[PDB]
Scaffold this motif. Sequence first.
Motif, PDB file in Angstrom:
ATOM      1  N   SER A  61      -8.252 -11.074 -12.196  1.00  0.00           N
ATOM      2  CA  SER A  61      -9.115 -10.477 -13.226  1.00  0.00           C
ATOM      3  C   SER A  61      -8.277  -9.686 -14.205  1.00  0.00           C
ATOM      4  N   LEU A  64      -3.706  -5.388 -17.976  1.00  0.00           N
ATOM      5  CA  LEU A  64      -3.693  -5.184 -16.547  1.00  0.00           C
ATOM      6  C   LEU A  64      -4.475  -6.307 -15.882  1.00  0.00           C
ATOM      7  N   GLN A 105      -5.597  -7.758 -11.868  1.00  0.00           N
ATOM      8  CA  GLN A 105      -5.619  -7.583 -10.420  1.00  0.00           C
ATOM      9  C   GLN A 105      -5.890  -8.921  -9.758  1.00  0.00           C
ATOM     10  N   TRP A 129      -0.960  -6.229  -8.708  1.00  0.00           N
ATOM     11  CA  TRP A 129      -1.280  -5.784 -10.046  1.00  0.00           C
ATOM     12  C   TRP A 129      -0.187  -6.203 -10.997  1.00  0.00           C
ATOM     13  N   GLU A 170       3.365  -5.321  -9.289  1.00  0.00           N
ATOM     14  CA  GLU A 170       3.493  -4.310  -8.262  1.00  0.00           C
ATOM     15  C   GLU A 170       2.419  -4.451  -7.199  1.00  0.00           C
ATOM     16  N   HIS A 180       0.448  -2.177  -3.837  1.00  0.00           N
ATOM     17  CA  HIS A 180      -0.359  -0.934  -3.896  1.00  0.00           C
ATOM     18  C   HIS A 180       0.354   0.355  -4.283  1.00  0.00           C
ATOM     19  N   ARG A 233       3.312   2.707  -3.857  1.00  0.00           N
ATOM     20  CA  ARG A 233       3.527   1.706  -4.905  1.00  0.00           C
ATOM     21  C   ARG A 233       4.908   1.065  -4.795  1.00  0.00           C
TER      22      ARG A 233
END
Lengths: 286, 282
Positions: free
Chosen positions: A12, A24, A26, A89, A105, A107, A109
Amino acid sequence: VPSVSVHPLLGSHVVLPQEPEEHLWQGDVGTEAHPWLSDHRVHQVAVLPGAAYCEMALAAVTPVLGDTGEVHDLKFHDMLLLDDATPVWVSAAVTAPGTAEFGVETHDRTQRATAVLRGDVDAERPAAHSIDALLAAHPNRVDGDELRAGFGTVGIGHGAAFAGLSEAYVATAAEPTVVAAVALPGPLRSGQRGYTVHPALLDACFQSVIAHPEVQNIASGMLLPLGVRRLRAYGSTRNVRYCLSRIVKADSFGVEADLELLDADGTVLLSAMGLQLGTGNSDKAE
Amino acid sequence: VPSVSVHPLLGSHVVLPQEPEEHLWQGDVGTEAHPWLSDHRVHQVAVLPGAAYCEMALAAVTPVLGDTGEVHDLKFHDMLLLDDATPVWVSAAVTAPGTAEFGVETHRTQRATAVLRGDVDAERPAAHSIDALLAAHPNRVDGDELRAGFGTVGIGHGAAFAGLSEAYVATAAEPTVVAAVALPGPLRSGQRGYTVHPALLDACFQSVIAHPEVQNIASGMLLPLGVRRLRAYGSTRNVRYCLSRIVKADSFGVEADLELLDADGTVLLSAMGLQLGTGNSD
Protein backbone atom coordinates in the motif's frame (compact mmCIF):
# COMPACT_ATOMS: atom_id res chain seq x y z
CA VAL A 1 -15.95 -2.64 -1.95
CA PRO A 2 -13.42 -0.62 -3.97
CA SER A 3 -9.90 -1.72 -4.49
CA VAL A 4 -6.54 -0.46 -5.69
CA SER A 5 -3.90 -2.43 -7.55
CA VAL A 6 -0.61 -2.78 -5.66
CA HIS A 7 2.87 -3.91 -6.43
CA PRO A 8 3.26 -7.43 -4.95
CA LEU A 9 6.15 -6.47 -2.64
CA LEU A 10 5.75 -2.73 -2.09
CA GLY A 11 2.08 -2.96 -1.07
CA SER A 12 0.00 0.00 0.00
CA HIS A 13 1.27 3.40 -1.13
CA VAL A 14 0.78 6.93 0.25
CA VAL A 15 2.40 10.30 -0.28
CA LEU A 16 3.17 12.00 3.05
CA PRO A 17 1.35 15.29 3.81
CA GLN A 18 4.52 17.37 3.78
CA GLU A 19 7.30 18.95 1.74
CA PRO A 20 9.49 17.89 0.07
CA GLU A 21 7.63 15.17 -1.80
CA GLU A 22 7.94 11.87 0.04
CA HIS A 23 6.42 8.45 -0.60
CA LEU A 24 5.78 5.63 1.85
CA TRP A 25 4.79 2.06 1.13
CA GLN A 26 3.90 -0.74 3.57
CA GLY A 27 4.26 -4.25 2.18
CA ASP A 28 4.60 -7.84 3.37
CA VAL A 29 7.46 -10.04 2.17
CA GLY A 30 6.58 -12.96 4.40
CA THR A 31 6.34 -16.53 3.20
CA GLU A 32 2.57 -16.77 3.75
CA ALA A 33 2.10 -13.87 1.31
CA HIS A 34 4.80 -15.13 -1.05
CA PRO A 35 5.27 -18.88 -0.62
CA TRP A 36 7.95 -18.88 -3.35
CA LEU A 37 10.22 -16.90 -0.96
CA SER A 38 10.48 -20.09 1.13
CA ASP A 39 12.76 -21.32 -1.70
CA HIS A 40 15.61 -18.86 -1.04
CA ARG A 41 17.40 -20.07 2.07
CA VAL A 42 20.63 -19.37 3.91
CA HIS A 43 21.59 -22.07 6.41
CA GLN A 44 18.13 -23.60 5.97
CA VAL A 45 16.20 -20.43 6.93
CA ALA A 46 14.26 -18.27 4.51
CA VAL A 47 16.02 -14.96 3.76
CA LEU A 48 14.88 -12.16 1.44
CA PRO A 49 17.10 -12.30 -1.66
CA GLY A 50 18.88 -9.14 -2.76
CA ALA A 51 17.02 -9.42 -6.06
CA ALA A 52 13.86 -8.49 -4.14
CA TYR A 53 15.35 -5.12 -3.13
CA CYS A 54 16.30 -4.54 -6.75
CA GLU A 55 12.71 -5.09 -7.84
CA MET A 56 11.40 -2.84 -5.09
CA ALA A 57 13.68 -0.02 -6.18
CA LEU A 58 12.87 -0.56 -9.89
CA ALA A 59 9.12 -0.57 -9.15
CA ALA A 60 9.39 2.70 -7.21
CA VAL A 61 10.88 4.82 -10.00
CA THR A 62 7.68 5.48 -12.00
CA PRO A 63 5.37 6.38 -9.10
CA VAL A 64 8.01 8.74 -7.67
CA LEU A 65 9.55 10.38 -10.71
CA GLY A 66 6.93 9.69 -13.37
CA ASP A 67 9.13 7.55 -15.69
CA THR A 68 10.67 4.06 -15.35
CA GLY A 69 14.10 5.72 -15.19
CA GLU A 70 16.83 3.77 -13.43
CA VAL A 71 18.29 2.94 -10.02
CA HIS A 72 21.73 3.93 -8.74
CA ASP A 73 23.89 2.65 -5.91
CA LEU A 74 21.51 0.06 -4.45
CA LYS A 75 22.97 -1.54 -1.32
CA PHE A 76 21.55 -4.26 0.90
CA HIS A 77 23.93 -5.29 3.67
CA ASP A 78 21.73 -6.69 6.46
CA MET A 79 20.08 -10.01 5.66
CA LEU A 80 16.34 -10.20 6.39
CA LEU A 81 15.09 -13.42 7.92
CA LEU A 82 11.52 -14.08 6.83
CA ASP A 83 8.50 -15.13 8.84
CA ASP A 84 4.94 -15.97 7.82
CA ALA A 85 4.42 -12.19 7.83
CA THR A 86 7.31 -9.82 7.41
CA PRO A 87 6.27 -6.21 7.13
CA VAL A 88 8.52 -3.85 5.18
CA TRP A 89 8.41 -0.11 4.77
CA VAL A 90 9.70 1.48 1.60
CA SER A 91 10.46 5.19 1.34
CA ALA A 92 11.34 7.59 -1.44
CA ALA A 93 12.14 11.26 -0.89
CA VAL A 94 12.55 13.58 -3.83
CA THR A 95 15.69 15.68 -3.37
CA ALA A 96 15.69 17.45 -6.71
CA PRO A 97 13.86 17.09 -9.99
CA GLY A 98 14.56 13.63 -11.33
CA THR A 99 16.29 12.33 -8.18
CA ALA A 100 15.02 10.58 -5.08
CA GLU A 101 16.55 8.86 -2.08
CA PHE A 102 15.17 5.35 -1.63
CA GLY A 103 15.12 3.19 1.51
CA VAL A 104 13.74 -0.11 2.76
CA GLU A 105 13.39 -0.84 6.45
CA THR A 106 11.87 -3.31 8.89
CA HIS A 107 10.11 -2.44 12.11
CA ASP A 108 13.62 -1.69 16.75
CA ARG A 109 14.20 -0.19 13.26
CA THR A 110 16.63 -1.89 10.83
CA GLN A 111 17.66 -0.52 7.43
CA ARG A 112 17.56 -3.18 4.70
CA ALA A 113 18.37 -1.24 1.56
CA THR A 114 19.34 2.18 0.24
CA ALA A 115 19.53 3.55 -3.27
CA VAL A 116 19.00 6.61 -5.46
CA LEU A 117 16.17 6.66 -8.00
CA ARG A 118 16.84 8.62 -11.23
CA GLY A 119 14.30 9.78 -13.80
CA ASP A 120 16.46 12.14 -15.85
CA VAL A 121 18.94 9.72 -17.43
CA ASP A 122 17.99 9.07 -21.05
CA ALA A 123 20.28 6.10 -21.47
CA GLU A 124 19.50 3.97 -24.54
CA ARG A 125 19.07 0.22 -24.77
CA PRO A 126 22.29 -1.69 -25.48
CA ALA A 127 22.33 -3.37 -28.91
CA ALA A 128 20.98 -6.90 -29.30
CA HIS A 129 23.14 -9.98 -29.44
CA SER A 130 23.32 -13.10 -31.56
CA ILE A 131 22.57 -15.89 -29.11
CA ASP A 132 24.21 -18.37 -31.49
CA ALA A 133 27.44 -16.30 -31.58
CA LEU A 134 27.46 -15.97 -27.79
CA LEU A 135 27.02 -19.72 -27.32
CA ALA A 136 29.67 -20.55 -29.96
CA ALA A 137 32.19 -18.43 -28.03
CA HIS A 138 31.45 -20.13 -24.70
CA PRO A 139 31.71 -23.85 -25.41
CA ASN A 140 31.99 -25.20 -21.88
CA ARG A 141 28.76 -26.10 -20.11
CA VAL A 142 28.11 -25.68 -16.39
CA ASP A 143 25.00 -27.56 -15.21
CA GLY A 144 22.49 -25.56 -13.20
CA ASP A 145 21.75 -28.44 -10.80
CA GLU A 146 25.47 -28.98 -10.18
CA LEU A 147 26.00 -25.25 -9.68
CA ARG A 148 23.19 -25.14 -7.12
CA ALA A 149 24.63 -28.22 -5.43
CA GLY A 150 27.86 -26.28 -4.98
CA PHE A 151 25.91 -23.38 -3.46
CA GLY A 152 24.39 -25.89 -1.05
CA THR A 153 27.86 -26.91 0.21
CA VAL A 154 28.28 -23.41 1.55
CA GLY A 155 24.74 -23.16 2.92
CA ILE A 156 22.77 -21.43 0.18
CA GLY A 157 19.64 -23.35 -0.68
CA HIS A 158 17.67 -22.57 -3.79
CA GLY A 159 14.38 -24.44 -4.04
CA ALA A 160 12.26 -24.85 -7.14
CA ALA A 161 11.21 -21.17 -7.38
CA PHE A 162 14.89 -20.17 -7.44
CA ALA A 163 16.02 -22.91 -9.84
CA GLY A 164 15.50 -20.93 -13.06
CA LEU A 165 19.16 -21.27 -14.17
CA SER A 166 19.24 -24.32 -16.47
CA GLU A 167 22.86 -24.11 -17.54
CA ALA A 168 25.68 -21.65 -18.01
CA TYR A 169 28.30 -21.49 -20.72
CA VAL A 170 31.87 -20.33 -20.28
CA ALA A 171 35.17 -20.33 -22.16
CA THR A 172 38.17 -20.16 -19.81
CA ALA A 173 39.07 -18.09 -16.77
CA ALA A 174 40.83 -15.67 -19.14
CA GLU A 175 37.62 -14.67 -20.99
CA PRO A 176 35.51 -12.53 -18.65
CA THR A 177 32.07 -13.52 -19.90
CA VAL A 178 29.41 -16.12 -19.05
CA VAL A 179 26.23 -16.87 -21.07
CA ALA A 180 23.44 -18.52 -19.18
CA ALA A 181 20.09 -20.01 -20.04
CA VAL A 182 17.73 -18.75 -17.38
CA ALA A 183 13.95 -18.43 -17.15
CA LEU A 184 11.30 -17.87 -14.54
CA PRO A 185 9.99 -21.26 -13.42
CA GLY A 186 6.64 -22.11 -15.02
CA PRO A 187 4.52 -22.04 -11.86
CA LEU A 188 5.53 -18.41 -11.13
CA ARG A 189 4.65 -17.20 -14.60
CA SER A 190 1.04 -16.51 -13.63
CA GLY A 191 2.09 -14.20 -10.79
CA GLN A 192 4.78 -12.15 -12.56
CA ARG A 193 2.09 -9.56 -13.36
CA GLY A 194 3.07 -6.31 -11.74
CA TYR A 195 6.76 -7.07 -11.47
CA THR A 196 9.36 -5.04 -13.39
CA VAL A 197 11.51 -8.16 -12.93
CA HIS A 198 10.49 -11.18 -10.94
CA PRO A 199 13.02 -11.49 -8.07
CA ALA A 200 13.29 -15.27 -8.56
CA LEU A 201 14.34 -14.73 -12.18
CA LEU A 202 16.78 -11.94 -11.33
CA ASP A 203 18.33 -14.09 -8.58
CA ALA A 204 18.85 -16.98 -11.02
CA CYS A 205 20.71 -14.46 -13.22
CA PHE A 206 22.90 -13.42 -10.25
CA GLN A 207 23.64 -17.13 -9.62
CA SER A 208 24.93 -17.55 -13.16
CA VAL A 209 27.82 -15.18 -12.44
CA ILE A 210 29.27 -17.76 -10.05
CA ALA A 211 29.63 -20.28 -12.90
CA HIS A 212 32.49 -18.22 -14.28
CA PRO A 213 35.80 -20.09 -13.97
CA GLU A 214 37.69 -17.07 -12.57
CA VAL A 215 35.07 -16.76 -9.84
CA GLN A 216 35.21 -20.49 -9.12
CA ASN A 217 39.00 -20.37 -8.86
CA ILE A 218 39.41 -17.32 -6.55
CA ALA A 219 36.22 -16.08 -4.89
CA SER A 220 35.89 -18.70 -2.21
CA GLY A 221 32.83 -19.30 -0.12
CA MET A 222 29.44 -17.82 0.37
CA LEU A 223 28.84 -15.25 -2.35
CA LEU A 224 25.66 -13.32 -1.92
CA PRO A 225 24.48 -10.12 -3.58
CA LEU A 226 25.35 -6.99 -1.60
CA GLY A 227 24.50 -4.25 -4.08
CA VAL A 228 24.12 -3.08 -7.66
CA ARG A 229 25.62 0.16 -9.00
CA ARG A 230 23.12 0.66 -11.83
CA LEU A 231 19.84 -1.11 -12.71
CA ARG A 232 17.62 -0.26 -15.68
CA ALA A 233 14.73 -2.06 -17.31
CA TYR A 234 14.08 -1.37 -21.00
CA GLY A 235 10.87 -3.30 -21.38
CA SER A 236 8.92 -6.20 -19.98
CA THR A 237 11.13 -8.98 -18.66
CA ARG A 238 8.41 -11.62 -19.06
CA ASN A 239 10.29 -13.18 -21.97
CA VAL A 240 13.86 -13.32 -20.52
CA ARG A 241 15.60 -16.53 -21.62
CA TYR A 242 19.31 -15.67 -21.27
CA CYS A 243 21.75 -13.72 -19.15
CA LEU A 244 25.07 -12.43 -20.44
CA SER A 245 27.45 -11.49 -17.61
CA ARG A 246 30.91 -9.95 -17.54
CA ILE A 247 33.25 -10.33 -14.62
CA VAL A 248 34.66 -6.88 -13.84
CA LYS A 249 36.56 -7.78 -10.65
CA ALA A 250 37.12 -11.01 -8.82
CA ASP A 251 39.26 -11.64 -5.77
CA SER A 252 39.21 -13.52 -2.44
CA PHE A 253 36.63 -11.15 -1.08
CA GLY A 254 34.04 -11.10 -3.80
CA VAL A 255 33.02 -10.32 -7.32
CA GLU A 256 31.84 -7.35 -9.34
CA ALA A 257 29.90 -8.17 -12.51
CA ASP A 258 27.82 -6.52 -15.21
CA LEU A 259 24.72 -8.38 -16.46
CA GLU A 260 22.32 -8.13 -19.40
CA LEU A 261 19.02 -10.04 -19.32
CA LEU A 262 18.08 -11.05 -22.86
CA ASP A 263 15.02 -12.44 -24.60
CA ALA A 264 15.51 -15.48 -26.83
CA ASP A 265 16.29 -13.18 -29.78
CA GLY A 266 19.15 -11.54 -27.89
CA THR A 267 17.35 -8.26 -27.18
CA VAL A 268 18.50 -6.61 -23.98
CA LEU A 269 15.58 -6.26 -21.57
CA LEU A 270 17.37 -5.21 -18.37
CA SER A 271 20.90 -4.09 -17.40
CA ALA A 272 22.47 -4.57 -13.96
CA MET A 273 25.89 -2.97 -13.85
CA GLY A 274 28.21 -3.34 -10.91
CA LEU A 275 26.52 -6.25 -9.18
CA GLN A 276 28.54 -6.90 -6.02
CA LEU A 277 28.76 -10.37 -4.57
CA GLY A 278 30.47 -11.03 -1.23
CA THR A 279 30.24 -12.85 2.09
CA GLY A 280 28.10 -10.26 3.83
CA ASN A 281 26.85 -10.97 7.33
CA SER A 282 25.07 -14.33 7.51
CA ASP A 283 25.55 -14.54 11.28
CA LYS A 284 21.82 -14.25 11.99
CA ALA A 285 21.00 -17.08 9.56
CA GLU A 286 23.44 -19.27 11.52
CA VAL B 1 -1.99 -8.24 -10.49
CA PRO B 2 -2.73 -8.11 -6.76
CA SER B 3 -5.06 -5.59 -5.22
CA VAL B 4 -6.15 -4.44 -1.78
CA SER B 5 -9.61 -3.35 -0.64
CA VAL B 6 -9.79 0.29 0.41
CA HIS B 7 -12.37 2.40 2.15
CA PRO B 8 -14.08 4.62 -0.50
CA LEU B 9 -13.11 7.86 1.33
CA LEU B 10 -10.11 7.03 3.48
CA GLY B 11 -8.23 5.40 0.59
CA SER B 12 -4.80 3.85 0.90
CA HIS B 13 -3.77 2.85 4.41
CA VAL B 14 -0.36 2.42 6.01
CA VAL B 15 0.97 2.10 9.52
CA LEU B 16 3.97 4.37 10.11
CA PRO B 17 7.29 2.66 10.88
CA GLN B 18 7.51 4.11 14.38
CA GLU B 19 6.34 4.08 17.99
CA PRO B 20 3.76 4.56 19.21
CA GLU B 21 1.31 2.98 16.78
CA GLU B 22 0.15 5.47 14.18
CA HIS B 23 -1.95 5.08 11.05
CA LEU B 24 -2.05 7.22 7.92
CA TRP B 25 -4.58 7.15 5.09
CA GLN B 26 -4.42 9.13 1.85
CA GLY B 27 -7.74 9.59 0.09
CA ASP B 28 -9.39 11.87 -2.46
CA VAL B 29 -12.71 13.55 -1.73
CA GLY B 30 -12.75 15.50 -4.97
CA THR B 31 -15.81 15.51 -7.20
CA GLU B 32 -14.11 13.48 -9.92
CA ALA B 33 -13.48 10.61 -7.47
CA HIS B 34 -16.94 11.06 -5.90
CA PRO B 35 -19.39 12.76 -8.26
CA TRP B 36 -22.12 12.58 -5.57
CA LEU B 37 -20.18 15.12 -3.48
CA SER B 38 -21.08 17.71 -6.13
CA ASP B 39 -24.59 17.57 -4.61
CA HIS B 40 -23.67 19.15 -1.24
CA ARG B 41 -23.18 22.86 -1.82
CA VAL B 42 -22.85 26.03 0.20
CA HIS B 43 -23.52 29.18 -1.80
CA GLN B 44 -23.31 27.03 -4.97
CA VAL B 45 -19.79 25.75 -4.14
CA ALA B 46 -19.28 22.04 -3.45
CA VAL B 47 -18.17 21.65 0.18
CA LEU B 48 -17.38 18.47 2.08
CA PRO B 49 -20.29 17.71 4.45
CA GLY B 50 -19.62 17.12 8.12
CA ALA B 51 -21.21 13.69 7.66
CA ALA B 52 -18.14 12.69 5.61
CA TYR B 53 -15.81 13.35 8.55
CA CYS B 54 -18.11 11.25 10.70
CA GLU B 55 -17.74 8.33 8.30
CA MET B 56 -13.94 8.78 8.14
CA ALA B 57 -13.75 8.61 11.93
CA LEU B 58 -16.13 5.63 12.23
CA ALA B 59 -14.20 3.79 9.51
CA ALA B 60 -10.92 4.39 11.30
CA VAL B 61 -11.92 2.79 14.63
CA THR B 62 -11.62 -0.87 13.70
CA PRO B 63 -8.26 -0.81 11.93
CA VAL B 64 -6.73 1.20 14.78
CA LEU B 65 -8.45 -0.27 17.82
CA GLY B 66 -8.81 -3.80 16.59
CA ASP B 67 -12.53 -4.17 17.20
CA THR B 68 -15.85 -2.53 17.87
CA GLY B 69 -15.51 0.98 19.28
CA GLU B 70 -16.86 4.50 19.01
CA VAL B 71 -15.88 8.09 18.22
CA HIS B 72 -15.71 10.89 20.79
CA ASP B 73 -15.70 14.65 20.44
CA LEU B 74 -15.57 14.94 16.69
CA LYS B 75 -15.20 18.55 15.59
CA PHE B 76 -15.18 20.09 12.11
CA HIS B 77 -12.85 23.01 11.46
CA ASP B 78 -12.55 25.21 8.35
CA MET B 79 -15.04 24.00 5.75
CA LEU B 80 -13.40 22.19 2.86
CA LEU B 81 -14.08 23.43 -0.63
CA LEU B 82 -13.96 20.58 -3.16
CA ASP B 83 -12.18 20.43 -6.52
CA ASP B 84 -12.01 17.71 -9.17
CA ALA B 85 -9.28 16.21 -6.98
CA THR B 86 -9.10 16.99 -3.29
CA PRO B 87 -6.49 14.96 -1.44
CA VAL B 88 -7.10 14.30 2.25
CA TRP B 89 -4.91 12.69 4.84
CA VAL B 90 -6.39 10.94 7.83
CA SER B 91 -4.27 10.13 10.88
CA ALA B 92 -4.82 8.09 14.04
CA ALA B 93 -2.25 7.84 16.80
CA VAL B 94 -2.68 5.46 19.72
CA THR B 95 -2.07 7.35 22.98
CA ALA B 96 -3.10 4.53 25.30
CA PRO B 97 -4.77 1.13 25.12
CA GLY B 98 -8.16 1.52 23.46
CA THR B 99 -7.66 5.22 22.69
CA ALA B 100 -6.37 7.15 19.70
CA GLU B 101 -6.22 10.74 18.51
CA PHE B 102 -7.85 11.19 15.12
CA GLY B 103 -7.25 13.92 12.60
CA VAL B 104 -8.12 14.93 9.05
CA GLU B 105 -5.99 17.43 7.11
CA THR B 106 -5.46 18.87 3.67
CA HIS B 107 -2.15 20.11 2.27
CA ARG B 108 -1.56 22.31 5.81
CA THR B 109 -5.05 22.85 7.24
CA GLN B 110 -6.76 20.77 9.93
CA ARG B 111 -10.26 19.78 8.85
CA ALA B 112 -11.44 17.53 11.67
CA THR B 113 -10.35 16.16 15.04
CA ALA B 114 -11.69 13.39 17.30
CA VAL B 115 -10.77 10.68 19.75
CA LEU B 116 -11.35 7.02 18.87
CA ARG B 117 -12.22 4.62 21.70
CA GLY B 118 -12.16 0.83 21.59
CA ASP B 119 -12.65 0.02 25.26
CA VAL B 120 -16.25 1.17 25.72
CA ASP B 121 -18.59 -1.80 26.12
CA ALA B 122 -21.61 0.33 25.31
CA GLU B 123 -24.94 -1.44 25.00
CA ARG B 124 -27.01 -1.13 21.84
CA PRO B 125 -30.06 1.07 22.55
CA ALA B 126 -33.40 -0.70 22.60
CA ALA B 127 -35.30 -0.88 19.33
CA HIS B 128 -38.33 1.35 18.62
CA SER B 129 -41.75 0.63 17.17
CA ILE B 130 -41.81 2.59 13.94
CA ASP B 131 -45.64 2.58 13.89
CA ALA B 132 -45.81 3.98 17.43
CA LEU B 133 -43.23 6.68 16.60
CA LEU B 134 -45.20 7.73 13.52
CA ALA B 135 -48.56 7.75 15.35
CA ALA B 136 -47.10 10.15 17.93
CA HIS B 137 -45.72 12.59 15.32
CA PRO B 138 -48.75 13.36 13.17
CA ASN B 139 -47.54 16.49 11.40
CA ARG B 140 -45.74 15.84 8.11
CA VAL B 141 -42.98 18.01 6.78
CA ASP B 142 -42.19 17.29 3.15
CA GLY B 143 -38.51 16.69 2.28
CA ASP B 144 -38.68 18.81 -0.87
CA GLU B 145 -40.18 21.70 1.12
CA LEU B 146 -37.52 21.32 3.79
CA ARG B 147 -34.75 21.37 1.17
CA ALA B 148 -36.38 24.40 -0.52
CA GLY B 149 -36.05 26.14 2.86
CA PHE B 150 -32.38 25.21 3.08
CA GLY B 151 -31.96 26.72 -0.36
CA THR B 152 -33.19 30.08 0.82
CA VAL B 153 -30.16 30.38 3.09
CA GLY B 154 -27.66 29.01 0.55
CA ILE B 155 -27.50 25.31 1.33
CA GLY B 156 -28.00 23.27 -1.81
CA HIS B 157 -28.73 19.57 -1.61
CA GLY B 158 -28.85 17.82 -4.98
CA ALA B 159 -30.15 14.33 -5.75
CA ALA B 160 -27.46 12.43 -3.80
CA PHE B 161 -28.34 14.42 -0.65
CA ALA B 162 -32.11 14.23 -1.14
CA GLY B 163 -32.60 11.07 0.91
CA LEU B 164 -34.97 12.69 3.45
CA SER B 165 -38.43 11.87 2.05
CA GLU B 166 -40.37 13.43 4.91
CA ALA B 167 -40.14 14.24 8.58
CA TYR B 168 -42.84 13.92 11.18
CA VAL B 169 -43.25 16.15 14.19
CA ALA B 170 -45.76 16.82 16.95
CA THR B 171 -45.42 20.33 18.42
CA ALA B 172 -42.51 22.44 19.68
CA ALA B 173 -43.26 21.06 23.14
CA GLU B 174 -42.33 17.50 22.13
CA PRO B 175 -38.57 17.37 21.53
CA THR B 176 -38.58 14.62 18.90
CA VAL B 177 -38.66 14.28 15.13
CA VAL B 178 -39.18 11.01 13.25
CA ALA B 179 -37.84 11.12 9.71
CA ALA B 180 -38.22 8.77 6.75
CA VAL B 181 -34.78 8.77 5.21
CA ALA B 182 -33.04 6.34 2.89
CA LEU B 183 -29.87 6.36 0.83
CA PRO B 184 -30.91 7.18 -2.76
CA GLY B 185 -30.96 4.08 -5.01
CA PRO B 186 -28.04 5.04 -7.33
CA LEU B 187 -25.69 5.18 -4.34
CA ARG B 188 -26.78 1.81 -2.93
CA SER B 189 -24.31 -0.09 -5.12
CA GLY B 190 -21.46 2.02 -3.68
CA GLN B 191 -22.74 1.62 -0.07
CA ARG B 192 -20.40 -1.33 0.29
CA GLY B 193 -17.39 -0.34 2.32
CA TYR B 194 -19.07 2.45 4.27
CA THR B 195 -19.93 2.24 7.97
CA VAL B 196 -22.53 4.89 7.07
CA HIS B 197 -22.83 6.53 3.66
CA PRO B 198 -22.24 10.28 4.26
CA ALA B 199 -25.17 11.19 1.96
CA LEU B 200 -27.48 9.16 4.22
CA LEU B 201 -26.11 10.57 7.44
CA ASP B 202 -26.37 14.13 6.11
CA ALA B 203 -30.05 13.55 5.27
CA CYS B 204 -30.53 12.44 8.87
CA PHE B 205 -28.84 15.66 10.13
CA GLN B 206 -31.14 17.66 7.83
CA SER B 207 -34.20 16.14 9.52
CA VAL B 208 -33.32 17.83 12.82
CA ILE B 209 -34.11 21.23 11.25
CA ALA B 210 -37.73 20.12 10.71
CA HIS B 211 -38.33 20.30 14.43
CA PRO B 212 -40.76 23.12 15.31
CA GLU B 213 -38.56 24.54 18.07
CA VAL B 214 -35.61 24.75 15.68
CA GLN B 215 -37.93 26.35 13.11
CA ASN B 216 -39.11 28.87 15.71
CA ILE B 217 -35.63 30.16 16.50
CA ALA B 218 -34.97 31.04 12.85
CA SER B 219 -31.17 30.82 13.13
CA GLY B 220 -30.57 30.95 9.42
CA MET B 221 -27.86 28.72 8.06
CA LEU B 222 -27.35 25.71 10.32
CA LEU B 223 -24.43 23.47 9.47
CA PRO B 224 -22.95 20.56 11.41
CA LEU B 225 -20.05 21.64 13.65
CA GLY B 226 -19.34 18.35 15.48
CA VAL B 227 -20.73 15.23 17.13
CA ARG B 228 -19.96 14.26 20.74
CA ARG B 229 -20.43 10.50 20.31
CA LEU B 230 -20.78 8.31 17.21
CA ARG B 231 -21.23 4.56 17.40
CA ALA B 232 -22.30 2.07 14.76
CA TYR B 233 -24.04 -1.14 15.97
CA GLY B 234 -24.48 -2.91 12.65
CA SER B 235 -24.67 -2.32 8.92
CA THR B 236 -26.51 0.85 7.97
CA ARG B 237 -27.43 -0.53 4.54
CA ASN B 238 -31.10 -0.89 5.58
CA VAL B 239 -31.60 2.40 7.42
CA ARG B 240 -35.04 3.81 6.60
CA TYR B 241 -35.74 6.09 9.58
CA CYS B 242 -34.10 8.56 11.94
CA LEU B 243 -35.37 9.48 15.36
CA SER B 244 -33.94 12.75 16.62
CA ARG B 245 -34.20 14.45 20.00
CA ILE B 246 -33.59 18.16 20.43
CA VAL B 247 -31.30 18.64 23.44
CA LYS B 248 -30.83 22.39 23.14
CA ALA B 249 -31.98 25.04 20.70
CA ASP B 250 -31.26 28.73 21.00
CA SER B 251 -29.85 31.75 19.18
CA PHE B 252 -26.37 30.19 19.18
CA GLY B 253 -27.24 26.83 17.63
CA VAL B 254 -28.85 23.46 18.09
CA GLU B 255 -27.79 20.26 19.79
CA ALA B 256 -29.53 16.97 19.02
CA ASP B 257 -29.22 13.22 19.56
CA LEU B 258 -29.97 10.91 16.63
CA GLU B 259 -30.69 7.22 16.15
CA LEU B 260 -30.65 5.71 12.65
CA LEU B 261 -33.22 2.91 12.44
CA ASP B 262 -34.15 0.14 10.00
CA ALA B 263 -37.80 -0.62 9.14
CA ASP B 264 -38.01 -2.85 12.24
CA GLY B 265 -36.95 0.08 14.40
CA THR B 266 -33.61 -1.49 15.31
CA VAL B 267 -30.95 1.08 16.20
CA LEU B 268 -28.07 0.79 13.74
CA LEU B 269 -26.15 3.96 14.51
CA SER B 270 -26.16 6.58 17.26
CA ALA B 271 -25.02 10.19 16.86
CA MET B 272 -25.27 11.91 20.22
CA GLY B 273 -24.62 15.61 20.65
CA LEU B 274 -24.79 16.63 17.03
CA GLN B 275 -24.03 20.35 17.08
CA LEU B 276 -25.49 22.63 14.40
CA GLY B 277 -24.60 26.30 14.04
CA THR B 278 -22.97 29.06 12.06
CA GLY B 279 -19.30 28.74 11.27
CA ASN B 280 -17.33 30.20 8.39
CA SER B 281 -19.39 29.98 5.22
CA ASP B 282 -17.34 32.86 3.81
